Design a binder for this molecule. Sequence first.
Ligand SMILES: CN(C)[C@@H]1C(=O)C(C(N)=O)=C(O)[C@@]2(O)C(=O)C3=C(O)c4c(O)c(NC(=O)CN5CCCC5)cc(F)c4C[C@H]3C[C@@H]12
Ligand SMILES: CN(C)[C@@H]1C(=O)C(C(N)=O)=C(O)[C@@]2(O)C(=O)C3=C(O)c4c(O)c(NC(=O)CN5CCCC5)cc(F)c4C[C@H]3C[C@@H]12
Ligand SMILES: [Mg+2]
Ligand SMILES: [Mg+2]
Ligand SMILES: [Mg+2]
Ligand SMILES: [Mg+2]
Ligand SMILES: [Mg+2]
Ligand SMILES: [Mg+2]
Ligand SMILES: [Mg+2]
Ligand SMILES: [Mg+2]
Ligand SMILES: [Mg+2]
Ligand SMILES: [Mg+2]
Ligand SMILES: [Mg+2]
Ligand SMILES: [Mg+2]
Ligand SMILES: [Mg+2]
Ligand SMILES: [Mg+2]
Ligand SMILES: [Mg+2]
Ligand SMILES: [Mg+2]
Ligand SMILES: [Mg+2]
Ligand SMILES: [Mg+2]
Ligand SMILES: [Mg+2]
Ligand SMILES: [Mg+2]
Ligand SMILES: [Mg+2]
Ligand SMILES: [Mg+2]
Ligand SMILES: [Mg+2]
Ligand SMILES: [Mg+2]
Ligand SMILES: [Zn+2]
Lengths: 38, 142, 211
Amino acid sequence: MKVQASVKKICGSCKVIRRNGVIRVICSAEPRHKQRQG
Amino acid sequence: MKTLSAKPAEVQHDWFVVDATGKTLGRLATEIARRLRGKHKTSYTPHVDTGDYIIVINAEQVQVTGNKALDKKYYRHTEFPGGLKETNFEKLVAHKPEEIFERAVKGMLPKGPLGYAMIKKMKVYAGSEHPHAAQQPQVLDI
Amino acid sequence: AIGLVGRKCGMTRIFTDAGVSVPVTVIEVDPNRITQIKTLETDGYQAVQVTTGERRESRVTNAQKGHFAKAGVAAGRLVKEFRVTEAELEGREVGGTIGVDLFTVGQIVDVTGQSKGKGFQGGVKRWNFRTQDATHGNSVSHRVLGSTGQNQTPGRVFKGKKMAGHLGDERVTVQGLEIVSVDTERSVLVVKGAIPGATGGDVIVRPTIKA
RNA sequence: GAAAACAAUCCAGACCGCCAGCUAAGGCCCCAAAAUCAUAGUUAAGUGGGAAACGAUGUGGGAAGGCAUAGACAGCUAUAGUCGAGUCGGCCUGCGCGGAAGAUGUAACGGG
RNA sequence: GUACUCUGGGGAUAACAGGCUGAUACCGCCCAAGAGUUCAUAUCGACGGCGGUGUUUGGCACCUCGAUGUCGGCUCAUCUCAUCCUGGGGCUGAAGCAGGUCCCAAGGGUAUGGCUGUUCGCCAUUUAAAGAGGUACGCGAGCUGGGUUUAGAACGUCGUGA
RNA sequence: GGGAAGCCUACCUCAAGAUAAGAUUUCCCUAGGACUUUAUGUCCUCUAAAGAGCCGUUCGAGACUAGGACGUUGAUAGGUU
Ligand SMILES: CN(C)[C@@H]1C(=O)C(C(N)=O)=C(O)[C@@]2(O)C(=O)C3=C(O)c4c(O)c(NC(=O)CN5CCCC5)cc(F)c4C[C@H]3C[C@@H]12
Ligand SMILES: CN(C)[C@@H]1C(=O)C(C(N)=O)=C(O)[C@@]2(O)C(=O)C3=C(O)c4c(O)c(NC(=O)CN5CCCC5)cc(F)c4C[C@H]3C[C@@H]12
Ligand SMILES: [Mg+2]
Ligand SMILES: [Mg+2]
Ligand SMILES: [Mg+2]
Ligand SMILES: [Mg+2]
Ligand SMILES: [Mg+2]
Ligand SMILES: [Mg+2]
Ligand SMILES: [Mg+2]
Ligand SMILES: [Mg+2]
Ligand SMILES: [Mg+2]
Ligand SMILES: [Mg+2]
Ligand SMILES: [Mg+2]
Ligand SMILES: [Mg+2]
Ligand SMILES: [Mg+2]
Ligand SMILES: [Mg+2]
Ligand SMILES: [Mg+2]
Ligand SMILES: [Mg+2]
Ligand SMILES: [Mg+2]
Ligand SMILES: [Mg+2]
Ligand SMILES: [Mg+2]
Ligand SMILES: [Mg+2]
Ligand SMILES: [Mg+2]
Ligand SMILES: [Mg+2]
Ligand SMILES: [Mg+2]
Ligand SMILES: [Mg+2]
Ligand SMILES: [Zn+2]
């Protein structure tokens, strides 16, 4: 997981979601693309 | 002179019973404090206690809005170093609803001997039963 | 849990067949006489009240005389309660006795007593404070407290600061002790290790709650 | 008098007395005088009641575009086939969200 | 010239500590040319940009000069978390054993000696670990007085000399 | 739904001055007159119990206190054996 103020999609397998008011990015292809914050 | 203050010996204290089920805590507490201080009577005197006795039943059913059930926190401090004790409304309403009502009405009553005298007239019980059937309280909704 | 009240009689040793020396304390038990049974209906909690020892008539007040007469047992030198559950109350009635056979060899028990009083003591003995230099220019400060706080912030002494004061003479419980012998004929329990208090003091033996 | 407390801020310039009335700044649920006042909306963050570059299908309101039931988009079958109306990608604009770690004790609405 | 010194005065005006500020210091973020055998973003990251703390060197002279007496050591502490060990997790250029980086977590614990007055620092040998800070750079009406800053004397240097 | 040496319980000690002053067992006191400001009123005469303290011999309790035991129906302390 990458915790960082700026979160963006890296590839076509990335998805932006909101959970309990927190912005996260989940990747089906690359686990290293998982992000949380901002 | 011509403006007369109420005499404590001549004051009459009635008894009322209130159900707290499905009511907002603060908007109930304002009326409770008003009636305890006696502002509703035309013989109101700031230095005399002219209120009435208020019994509160079903105290654990009191409600709060928003996310306050989880977010409203209650604090106290033991005078030992680093002794800060901290709790939540959800747990406090399950444990000691009387503390909930006591804090809510104390915050609104005056801070002094007269306020301490006034707060003693509020009786809070978790269940729907109270031990003051001898006083023949009348039903009051507020 | 249900327990026994006894008197500390002194320390000794027991030798095993292999020759190991086991230190032990002896507890003399005058069998406990039940005085009152408390219940949820009358008292709101479940306890068993017992008395032990003897007291001469001139030292028993009329109220205690009536209390003893209600249960029909002789007055003792003390009265103590044990909190109990529903199962323990079975077989227990006013006027009954608890001797010594309540315990068995090898059972782990807790022993509670009153510790020896050391009077008014200082930091070195009460709190294990360290002394300052005996030489090298130290004037009159060997066993003194030292610094007791910070500067103008906070400007006070924090409550609970360790200082000189009375030490000892308090209730103390020791856990994890083992029953080495249960002498019914002499009505004594021999337990391994040491227990609080001086010879002749009153002690309480209970089944261990950490097991 | 008001801004909790607060010379330099806002209102206002105290000759004395009154248990009379109207107003200024600021206010009207309780501490504490006065609306739990009336009609339209917005916010869900206790935002209100500290805050930056930057980040985001949060939620409203606007002026315009591509495509489309001679069948639009997303799913499924090997550019076609069954589903059966809205669907896409941008520009403004109101209120909200992360960015947000400190030392005695809640301690960033005076409190409830 | 005065450290052999003296009187009248000033926090109208310096040295310590407190206060305002945050250039400096420390920490956290934004962009991503490149380094990573290919791949910016496992680990780093050029040129530039935005913040936080009050932990450094500083700026100002608001309190104290009819006095707020201490560099280090000793004794005794209390708090913060930007976490040293122990506890729970994501990613990995994570086979295992061990690592790297990030998130949560402050309950407890978190060395003895040689040298110097040292705070530090280097060294020897241990430990699971020998954390970073605030509290008048905690603590001297609780102790010491080695450094430093009176009065004696000597060397190097400066001055004709004091 | 799961989920940490972290939070509340859990282990030990204190705790109803908790003025909200709580609960249980047992024990004790069951007499007459006068007056007036008509009241849990004031005075006298008669009675004072259940207990507590003073005092003493003392302690493994202790600065002084407090606390524990005992005081002839006695082993509390000293002596004696
Ligand atoms: C004394 N009275 C007037 C107030 C009062 O009464 C209360 C109170 N609680 O009572 C108080 O908050 C105050 O006293 C106070 O001190 C405040 C602030 O700090 C402050 C601030 O700092 C910045 N931001 C910056 O200046 C940034 N700089 C400027 C450019 C870049 C650097 C902006 C800002 F609006 C404020 C508000 C004041 C208010 C003030
Ligand atoms: C409600 N209570 C808590 C206060 C209160 O009672 C009063 C009052 N008058 O009574 C009020 O002033 C307040 O409500 C308030 O609103 C304040 C501010 O503005 C403010 C501020 O802005 C900045 N700094 C900046 O903004 C700019 N920085 C540049 C980089 C990023 C941000 C710094 C700062 F300390 C403050 C103080 C607050 C105080 C607050
Ligand atoms: Mg003693
Ligand atoms: Mg000596
Ligand atoms: Mg001396
Ligand atoms: Mg000496
Ligand atoms: Mg202000
Ligand atoms: Mg304000
Ligand atoms: Mg004022
Ligand atoms: Mg005038
Ligand atoms: Mg008017
Ligand atoms: Mg009002
Ligand atoms: Mg706020
Ligand atoms: Mg502001
Ligand atoms: Mg002078
Ligand atoms: Mg000045
Ligand atoms: Mg300074
Ligand atoms: Mg100062
Ligand atoms: Mg400075
Ligand atoms: Mg000036
Ligand atoms: Mg002075
Ligand atoms: Mg210091
Ligand atoms: Mg001092
Ligand atoms: Mg010296
Ligand atoms: Mg000379
Ligand atoms: Mg002899
Ligand atoms: Zn991806």
